[PDB]
């Protein structure tokens, strides 16, 4: 279905973002235009969040991928509980993924990056489930999100 094309595309974007964060080269050309555009603006947003929440985030400790999931779902539920979805807020989901990875590789004395793969799963799930409706209806990624932040 058209649902399946959307969900693999979103998974690809979340996997791309994770590898950008961890400075890993993914194969082929490099990343798609849409992925590169997302990576640049999500990073912009992420650093803006990190400086606005310095005092705050120093108290946050993400121990494992399971505690990262608990926090991700709680934070995304509280972010969209006012029912408003716009592209900027969609970017913030990625931006927050990035923060969860940084906190998780910070504390892990043995950082196992096989299992960090699971982060991109739960991120893609949240986007596909909560905001995927909105995305198809608002131009997609290719003409919706690109035309806005390229």
């Amino acid at each position: 279905s058209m649902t399946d094309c959307e969900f693999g595309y979103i998974y690809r974007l979340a996997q791309d973002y994770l590898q950008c964060v961890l400075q890993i080269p993914q194969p082929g050309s490099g990343p798609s235009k849409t992925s590169r555009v997302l990576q640049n603006v999500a990073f912009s947003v992420q650093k803006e969040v990190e400086k606005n929440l310095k005092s705050c985030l120093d108290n946050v400790n993400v121990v494992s991928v399971d505690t990262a999931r608990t926090l991700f779902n709680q934070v995304m539920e509280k972010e969209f509980e006012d029912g408003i979805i716009n592209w900027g807020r969609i970017v913030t989901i990625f931006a927050f993924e990035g923060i969860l990875i940084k906190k998780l590789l910070r504390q892990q004395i043995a950082p196992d990056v096989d299992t960090y793969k699971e982060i991109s799963y739960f991120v893609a799930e949240f986007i596909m489930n909560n905001t995927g409706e909105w995305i198809r209806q608002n131009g997609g990624w290719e003409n919706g999100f690109v035309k806005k932040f390229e």
């Binding site: 803006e48 606005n52 509280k78 972010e79 716009n86 900027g88 807020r89 913030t92 927050f96 806005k148």
Partner: peptide, 17 residues
């Protein structure tokens, strides 16, 4: 705090772009 920041900033960047 975290929810606030993502909302504010996320909404701001939507405005800006």
């Amino acid at each position: 705090x975290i929810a606030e920041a993502l909302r504010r900033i996320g909404d701001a960047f939507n405005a800006a772009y």
